[PDB]
Amino acid sequence: TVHVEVHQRGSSTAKKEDINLSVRKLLNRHNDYTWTEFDEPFLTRNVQSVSIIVALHIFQLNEIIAANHWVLPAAEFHGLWDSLVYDVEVKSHLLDYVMTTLLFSDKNVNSNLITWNRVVLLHGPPGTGKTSLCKALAQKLTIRLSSRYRYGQLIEINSHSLFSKLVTKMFQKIQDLIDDKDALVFVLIDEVIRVVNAVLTQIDQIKRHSNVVILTTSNIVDRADIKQYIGPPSAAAIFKIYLSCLEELMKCQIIYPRQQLLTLRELEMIGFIENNVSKLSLLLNDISRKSEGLSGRVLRKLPFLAHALYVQAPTVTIEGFLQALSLAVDKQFEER
């Protein structure tokens, strides 16, 4: 189908019925695009964004010791999903796998006949956004399952538990959130003796519940029925990442004035020929090629370094910015 994500304003107390009614009628007048300004006043009042990304998901964002807790969908994770860029379709695959995992628990499929369980292992080299993808994935499952779960919960356990009871108090609090069966509960552990044994025993207990999924990451438990390698970005991915940063700096008028930037597709479409818009993306494509082997984490830090080291003013040109970024990629390599 087509998926339409409807961000309702924090302040709004309008019912989803009306948001739903009104947003379908908006889509009749316009037989993937994001809307931020609307003709109908009810929309401008109640709705921050409609986003083709026909099923509607309407959500509001929400704003324990040795764990971070978030009610999903969380303000902190808004845009996290779109921010993460992989060579292959890992994101759409993970979403599909965890969603059939949850259909199968719902309908109580015997896991002895068809193998499935509610634990996910993202593994691979560091700087890859494995933890951000676990968060991004929790957010998106929560948004897409509003018709089954009223809200979600995320508990990120700190494997800074190798320090000097505690564990029984944490999992008791976690159990209290699990008891609410309107809530899809995610428990996130990054990989790393009687204490370790106690958390592993506690995971085994909570992993029994229908509404619990265990997200795990490894820079390398052991029985997760969905394992997924997440590797570093290629030139194409690096181009998308950099382009999301330049667009964000033109949104915020740090890069002034707005110039149009072409995507790698859009410049394949015109056979890479140089005009006065397309030359800025031809330069990005060179900067991308000379960035390959850097992690997503370094890539999303580079536009900050570029600005701090090589751009004085509150504003700078797209031509000015790409010069600084180019310089920033060189400093990154000349240090390592």
Swiss-Prot record:
Organism lineage: Eukaryota, Metazoa, Chordata, Craniata, Vertebrata
The family database entries (InterPro entries) matched by this protein are listed as: AAA+_ATPase, ATPase_AAA_core, ATPase_AAA_CS, ClpA/B, P-loop_NTPase, Pch2-like
Explain what the record says happens when changing residue 7 to R. In OZEMA9; decreased protein level in patient cells
Gene3D superfamilies referenced in this protein's UniProt entry, alphabetically:
P-loop containing nucleotide triphosphate hydrolases
The GO terms this record gives for MF are:
ATP binding; ATP hydrolysis activity; identical protein binding; transcription coregulator activity
Sequence positions that bind ATP = 124-131
Is ATP-binding one of the keywords? yes
- What is the name of this protein? Pachytene checkpoint protein 2 homolog
Q: Which SUPFAM superfamilies match?
A: P-loop containing nucleoside triphosphate hydrolases (SSF52540)
What cellular component GO annotations does this protein have?
chromosome; male germ cell nucleus; nucleus
- What is any Pfam family matched here? AAA_lid_TRIP13_C
The answer on whether this UniProt entry bears the keyword Ubl conjugation reads no
